[PDB]
Design an enzyme around this catalytic site. Structure first.
Site, PDB file in Angstrom:
ATOM      1  N   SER A   1      -0.368  -4.318   5.414  1.00  0.00           N
ATOM      2  CA  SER A   1       0.157  -3.241   4.595  1.00  0.00           C
ATOM      3  C   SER A   1       1.623  -3.566   4.346  1.00  0.00           C
ATOM      4  O   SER A   1       2.479  -3.247   5.164  1.00  0.00           O
ATOM      5  CB  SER A   1       0.011  -1.903   5.317  1.00  0.00           C
ATOM      6  OG  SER A   1       0.709  -0.877   4.642  1.00  0.00           O
ATOM      7  N   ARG A   2       1.907  -4.216   3.223  1.00  0.00           N
ATOM      8  CA  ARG A   2       3.264  -4.680   2.927  1.00  0.00           C
ATOM      9  C   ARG A   2       4.338  -3.601   2.937  1.00  0.00           C
ATOM     10  O   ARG A   2       5.518  -3.893   3.153  1.00  0.00           O
ATOM     11  CB  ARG A   2       3.292  -5.413   1.598  1.00  0.00           C
ATOM     12  CG  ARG A   2       2.854  -6.825   1.735  1.00  0.00           C
ATOM     13  CD  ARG A   2       2.668  -7.462   0.409  1.00  0.00           C
ATOM     14  NE  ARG A   2       1.580  -8.413   0.516  1.00  0.00           N
ATOM     15  CZ  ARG A   2       0.675  -8.608  -0.429  1.00  0.00           C
ATOM     16  NH1 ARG A   2       0.739  -7.908  -1.561  1.00  0.00           N
ATOM     17  NH2 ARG A   2      -0.295  -9.493  -0.237  1.00  0.00           N
ATOM     18  N   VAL A   3       3.934  -2.362   2.684  1.00  0.00           N
ATOM     19  CA  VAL A   3       4.851  -1.245   2.803  1.00  0.00           C
ATOM     20  C   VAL A   3       5.159  -1.028   4.282  1.00  0.00           C
ATOM     21  O   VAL A   3       6.249  -0.584   4.635  1.00  0.00           O
ATOM     22  CB  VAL A   3       4.318   0.019   2.128  1.00  0.00           C
ATOM     23  CG1 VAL A   3       5.337   1.124   2.228  1.00  0.00           C
ATOM     24  CG2 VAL A   3       4.024  -0.267   0.669  1.00  0.00           C
TER      25      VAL A   3
END
Ligand code: ANP
Ligand code: ANP
Ligand code: ANP
Ligand code: MG
Ligand code: MG
Ligand code: MG
Lengths: 53, 486, 469, 484, 121
Positions: free
Chosen positions: D349-351
């Site tokens: 989850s790059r966030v």
């Protein structure tokens, strides 16, 4: 003595292993060659279709 | 110019000739061109007709005339063909005069429906110990012979066709099995040599040869098995029996792919046209055992399929497997190891055979089919060696003995009565003592012995078809009797 | 006065008819041509323009000539419906093909109907027991749901179909439809015979099962449409008679295949692997009709062919969407002697939840799968190097799984001719307890072959002693 | 007069060639004389390509086609909640008319570079494994990907269920409204899913847009787009929606059908030339709006289905590129008992930890990187050899975290439940406990904490963080429950 | 890029150009070439992949007025460096920084491949 027997066990175990592996290779060499071809065929059908118009 | 019965060539190339006129022509009607070359109208469009040629493109110019035939693509059928060699359309090529035509039938016919068929019971005797024991074929059944290049596929078909000589020298039409052999895309010289071999066994006299070979137009190769079916069918619709061998269907498919692709029909899997399954289906469905009401006449098909690198999961192989009533699969591995026929018992099945098999064979063959596949599996874990077992080591002897027993010289189809004694000696184990290098000897030695001594049994097996316990114990004695002397 | 026109084109199954009047027959309409022997039915598939319609033929089109007269019937291909069909073998266009003359039916529905709406849906989670260890334990079937039998050529789809018609269809006490789509005629004939002998069809009495056939000898148009005919008779019992119907279709793949054979000639640009662009909606327009409404129920089991042993071929790939239960038959397995050749991992059921089957039932099958995945995760280590190179834990879970894999193979009543063994019908409650015990280690010392081709746990010991002396 | 009306030139396979309709707009609705609807997708000099929205038995040549004057659009607003609708917003749950606060278009622009705010608010799934390792934020696009039957809908379904915690409260900015889009599914599944949501009393905050298997392709094509618009209303008015495209693979198949039948020339794998734009424009509409726009959010969970785990394929790659991260699901892990079957290595989850509750981030630091070094050692022990001080430690540890991240379906957990369990696992109070018993440890350590250390749980819930003091109590309580 | 070229030729300064992602440039041409109805090339790309890239990339150069230095992110589809897009990109570079998944999954950032990453200098 134990050392010697082991060497013979490793000789014999690898005799079997590399024969099984060889048998796998032959099978997979058929599967590679089919997939090799269906991948050429499919790309070509895809291209040939792309000019059906 | 009579645009109703005549046409004019608009264009030609890729084996297709587009024709203006021919107004009243039917779909799939045969045509004759100026050159003499015949064709088939496959596409009926407003203004022109798409026509697929049964010869070389060269023989059709633009402008030329196109004569109607008033006939759907058809063949000369009937008994006056027995002994002849014909191309795909019926024309003779063995130079033996015009064909003695009983009449003509359509190349393409619908296979008989659900009702006019009868479940198979009458055995097709091959003369091959391995086949007649482990994958028995019945009259009306369709059995695929599938394997690699040069694996004795044709051999199995040929020995069967020879073996039929037995029953074909007598009055009984019910016992007779006339033969149709279909040569699709083979070397012309191969067929020549094959027909010659039929002649050297007086088998030609009860068989018809259909041949569209390797240099012949694809539509002639695609067509041949269908016109052949019609020839076979005449015996079916007339209360008689017939065997049709399709050699092979691979080459047929490749030819029909050629036809399809040049016609612009979308390439699918392995660039085969969509209806290539249906190509073979409708052919192979035409072989069936007809009902009591329909004269009980039968057509029994043996299609041949060539696999690459022994891949049975290929498209055409699986297709034909999904049509036929089973497959006799020949391993190249076993064939190269000298085990001929090379029937892989693991990958071979007759789906309706246990009911067609000669009742006497079934009895002595008890779980041999299921046994061999178990033995060949046991002999795989037999890699050692430093772990020599005492238990299953006896099934390892049986195996090698039974393996030896089923091996067969080509052109040695034995009678069904000459079979059960041999198998009885194997299954029950009167062979576990005899050396492996003298089982072929044991075979000829044991036949001669029975032929002279216990001829009463060999005649009772042939005529009863069963084995009574009195005849079973009679065989038993004569077996141990011969064992004591070898 | 009816609505008539002239054939203008014929290419394979495709027939181009032009009308010389103002009215043009609707798509899906049946059109007739009086032939030398019978009548050729055509079905309108598209309107080409300039008053010509394109149609798919229902039978071979040899002998047809341009300009030929063609009658519009005024509606879609229609079939007989009601109890009147039970005992009778029916064609694709509703004709009898059992040589027993007319079917004086109450009504004649058209084969093309819109599938039940979303609010018309009614859902549940009921196990349909089969007497087949594998399915019952690992991936059980839905009562009133759709079931798929996946397999390549000859891995045993049709045999598996038969065992089910044999286990569930007599016992059922509802009505059943069998629609043979693009398969062997010999098999339809065989089925017909077996039904008569099992009393499921009493020719001179009453019957539980109507039969519809469109076998692999029939042209594309027939193999495309015959599935919907059998479906139409099926629906009529579900909606009008409020019944629970069983629909057995061998083979549902043959329907898409058929569509592909015409798809080119309908002038559609080919899709992936040469299939119709309409492959997924075509399948929906059939499959969505086979379902359980509030008015009544349909449980369907369908055999699915798999071209070149390819589960990712578009046809069967698309089907997985429609199935509440899938049992997948692996060639690899069938070639190890294990029948039925069910892949114990690759097969899936919607109903394998602890709160439909019981937590106790759920836990057993779960660990079986765990075990079978571990034996799979080692397959190649073994195949190359053997058992000798495995840690003692692994070596044990392999000894257990090898028993488990043979224990899932079962003698089938209908497969008696091939087995040589009498057929068993293990009970769901039996199947769980048996496998729970084997998981608990109670039968490690027992020979593996004692597990081969048996019923429940007691048969293993019963046969283990037969293997003693 | 052919400005407003056209006659039918030819009709087949959900496509109709119409002559006239001169003043028609690209992508305008049409009515046929029979009542069926359509969409003008191709405008050429002589004719108009129209995809049908219904059965072409109902169209014939010479029939009269009518302009609507309308670009494709849908009813939108809070009136849709609880209802089930088709691709065009028509009600299909048979409960009567919808209460539309307005009518958004089918194809809206995404918000540009400006009207946007960084993703910082957690969308809580309740799945111990997701919220520790792949935490999904507000305004995020997180792909659920894997083979058939690997728990793809299961993961997104458990998120919808979970939001119940905040959706029953008054607080309007903690809420999350749900839109489930079913593209290509059979109707017996959608019905059975709406019932599941009703059981868990989660339909009330949920909108079900469906374009099922039997439906004309353009309706499956359109369904994620008009559902976006439905969901966008929440984003556009200070509220927060979560849209689920189950699945986008089936949508892509629908789009290829349209185009091939419209005879638009195909591309790679017979797909349209822009089967990326299809998805990229759709998935850019999931945003987090600026304060100047009310700070609302559309969060997307697209689903893609792979054939044999081939993440290298055309469409799965296209969508991997669009989204802000991916959750990979694998049968290999699924059948080994690990559920959800989340491939911890590939999943991101790059966030990231910016989209995750403080009290979770702290206990779950390097838990993903550790589980990454765990498989590394598990392949070292694949050629089984002697285990030392280092290896025998991390193997025994990581076997218990993997185990701890197993989670029953239909069972989300609150963040004050996840936080102790992870501290219990990561800090090393699970290592001497039999691997097979962690299940009972989860249920038992939670029942224990609810009685005594209720101080800890309501502190953790409210302040969302952890003090040096709070962690000291969590250190105690876990040791305090080690000898039973 | 046209904004960059001005500073190089007018201000005559050493300009920096940061493109992200260059892959999209190619992927979009692929889409328009498809839609213009061209016959797609291998892997379905535009038949003008190389020259379309050439046209763009050859502008990013050091002239005798000023400099354009450009750093470019290149998305490599399905971790595959032999894909025609990044394949066509390599030719144009002076130095390359390859980021490898096998490096990033062990936990090494920046995820650079110390052998695959090459440079003129
Ligand atoms: N039982 C047998 N014993 C000895 N030789 C045999 C036997 N069967 C076949 N052969 C020979 O082995 C060769 C291969 O068999 P053949 O009948 O040509 O099979 P095939 O599969 O049709 N080969 P091909 O036609 O080239 O694909 C031929 O030379 C046969 O004469
Ligand atoms: N349940 C079973 N038990 C034992 N043997 C079986 C079983 N199923 C299949 N077989 C064997 O394998 C063959 C399978 O035939 P069948 O059941 O028709 O499968 P299929 O997949 O329908 N074949 P096809 O339709 O031609 O692709 C049979 O002839 C049997 O020899
Ligand atoms: N955590 C879990 N524990 C136990 N069972 C589960 C879990 N998650 C999913 N399942 C079951 O596994 C099955 C497949 O899950 P599902 O959510 O359908 O994934 P999917 O990829 O959507 N399958 P499909 O949509 O049919 O391709 C369902 O029957 C679930 O009930
Ligand atoms: Mg040959
Ligand atoms: Mg079958
Ligand atoms: Mg799902």
């Amino acid at each position: 003595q134990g050392y010697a027997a082991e060497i013979s066990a490793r000789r014999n175990a690898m005799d079997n292993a590399s024969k099984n592996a060889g048998d796998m290779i032959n099978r997979y060499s058929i599967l590679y060659n089919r997939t090799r071809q269906a991948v050429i065929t499919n790309e070509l059908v895809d291209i040939i279709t792309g000019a059906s118009s | 110019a009579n645009l109703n019965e005549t046409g004019r060539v608009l264009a030609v190339g890729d084996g297709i000739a587009r024709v203006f006129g021919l107004n009243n022509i039917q779909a799939e009607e045969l045509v004759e061109f100026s050159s003499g070359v015949k064709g088939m109208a496959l596409i009926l469009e407003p203004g022109q007709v798409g026509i697929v040629l049964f010869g070389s493109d060269r023989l059709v110019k633009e402008g030329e005339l196109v004569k109607r035939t008033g006939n759907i693509v058809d063949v000369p059928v009937g008994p006056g063909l027995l002994g002849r060699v014909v191309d795909a359309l019926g024309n003779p090529i063995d130079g033996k005069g015009p064909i003695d035509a009983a009449g003509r039938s359509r190349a393409q016919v619908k296979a008989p429906g659900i009702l006019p068929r009868r479940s198979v019971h009458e055995p097709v005797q091959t003369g091959l110990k391995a086949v007649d024991a482990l994958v028995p074929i019945g009259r009306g059944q369709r059995e695929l012979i599938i394997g690699d290049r040069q694996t004795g596929k044709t051999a199995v078909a040929l020995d069967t066709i020879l073996n039929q000589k037995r029953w074909n020298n007598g009055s009984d039409e019910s016992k007779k099995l006339y033969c149709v052999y279909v040569a699709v895309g083979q070397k012309r010289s191969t067929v020549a040599q094959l027909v010659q071999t039929l002649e050297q066994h007086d088998a030609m006299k009860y068989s018809i040869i259909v041949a569209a070979t390797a240099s012949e137009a694809a539509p002639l190769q695609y067509l041949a098995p269908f016109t052949a079916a019609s020839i076979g069918e005449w015996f079916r619709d007339n209360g008689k029996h017939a065997l049709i061998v399709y050699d092979d269907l691979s080459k047929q498919a490749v030819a029909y792919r050629q036809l399809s692709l040049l016609l612009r029909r979308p390439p699918g899997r392995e660039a085969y046209p969509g209806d290539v399954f249906y190509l073979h289906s409708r052919l192979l469905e035409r072989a069936a055992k007809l009902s009591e009401k329909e004269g009980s006449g039968s057509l029994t098909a043996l299609p041949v399929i060539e696999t690459q690198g022994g891949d049975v999961s290929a498209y055409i192989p699986t297709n034909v497997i999904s049509i036929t009533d089973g497959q006799i699969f020949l391993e190249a591995e076993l064939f190269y190891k000298g085990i001929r026929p090379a029937i892989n018992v693991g990958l071979s099945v007759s789906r309706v055979g246990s009911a067609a098999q000669v009742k006497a064979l079934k009895q002595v063959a008890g779980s041999l089919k299921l046994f061999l596949a178990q033995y060949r599996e046991v002999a795989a874990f037999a890699q050692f060696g430093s772990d020599l077992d005492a238990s299953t080591k006896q099934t390892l002897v049986r195996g090698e003995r039974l393996t030896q027993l089923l091996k067969q010289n080509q052109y040695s189809p034995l009678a069904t009565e000459e079979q059960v004694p041999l198998i009885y000696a194997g299954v029950n184990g009167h062979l576990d003592g005899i050396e492996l290098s003298r089982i072929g000897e044991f075979e000829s030695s044991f036949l001669s012995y029975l032929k002279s001594n216990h001829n009463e049994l060999l005649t009772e097996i042939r005529e009863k078809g069963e084995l009574s316990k009195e005849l079973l114990a009679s065989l038993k004695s004569a077996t141990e009797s011969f064992v004591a002397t070898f | 006065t009816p609505i008539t026109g002239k054939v203008t084109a014929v290419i394979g199954a495709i027939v181009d008819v032009h009308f010389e009047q103002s009215e043009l027959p609707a798509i899906l309409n049946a059109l007739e041509i009086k032939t030398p022997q019978g009548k050729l039915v055509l079905e309108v598939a598209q309107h080409l323009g300039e008053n010509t319609v394109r149609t798919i033929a229902m039978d071979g089109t040899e002998g047809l000539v341009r300009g030929e007269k063609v009658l519009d019937t005024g509606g879609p291909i229609s079939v007989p419906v009601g109890r009147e069909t039970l005992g009778r073998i029916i064609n694709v266009i509703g004709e009898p093909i059992d040589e027993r003359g007319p079917i004086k039916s109450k009504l004649r529905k058209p084969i093309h109907a819109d599938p039940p709406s979303f609010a018309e849906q009614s859902t549940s989670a009921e196990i349909l027991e089969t007497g087949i260890k594998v399915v019952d334990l690992l991936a059980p079937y839905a009562r009133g749901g759709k079931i798929g039998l996946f397999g390549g050529a000859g891995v045993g789809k049709t045999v598996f179909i038969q065992e089910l018609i044999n286990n569930i269809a007599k016992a059922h006490g509802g009505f059943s439809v069998f629609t043979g789509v693009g398969e062997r005629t010999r098999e339809g004939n065989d089925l017909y015979r077996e039904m008569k002998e099992t009393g499921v069809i009493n020719l001179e009495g009453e019957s539980k099962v109507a039969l519809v056939f469109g076998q692999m000898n029939e042209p594309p148009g027939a193999r495309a449409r015959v599935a919907l005919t059998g479906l139409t008779i099926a629906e009529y019992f579900r909606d009008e008679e409020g019944q629970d119907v069983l629909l057995f279709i061998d083979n549902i793949f043959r329907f898409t295949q058929a569509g592909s054979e015409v798809s080119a000639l309908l002038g559609r640009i080919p899709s992936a692997v040469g299939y119709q662009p309409t492959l997924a909606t075509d399948m929906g327009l059939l499959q969505e009709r086979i379902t359980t409404t509030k008015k009544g129920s349909v449980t369907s089991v369908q055999a699915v062919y798999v071209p070149a042993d390819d589960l990712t071929d578009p046809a069967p790939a698309t089907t997985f969407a429609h199935l509440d239960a899938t049992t997948v038959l692996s060639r690899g397995i069938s070639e190890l002697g294990i029948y039925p050749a069910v892949d114990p991992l690759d097969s899936k059921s919607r109903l394998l939840d602890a709160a439909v089957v019981g937590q106790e039932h759920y836990d057993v099958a779960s660990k079986v799968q765990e075990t079978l995945q571990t034996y799979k995760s080692l397959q190649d280590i073994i195949a190359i190097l053997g058992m000798d190179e495995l840690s003692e834990q692994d070596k044990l879970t392999v000894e257990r799984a090898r028993k488990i894999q043979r224990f899932l193979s079962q003698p089938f009543a209908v497969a008696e001719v091939f087995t040589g063994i009498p057929g068993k019908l293990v009970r769901l409650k039996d199947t769980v307890a048996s496998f729970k015990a084997v998981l608990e280690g109670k039968y490690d010392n027992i020979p593996e072959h004692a597990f081969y081709m048996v019923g429940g746990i007691e048969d293993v010991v019963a046969k283990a002693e037969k293997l003693a002396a």
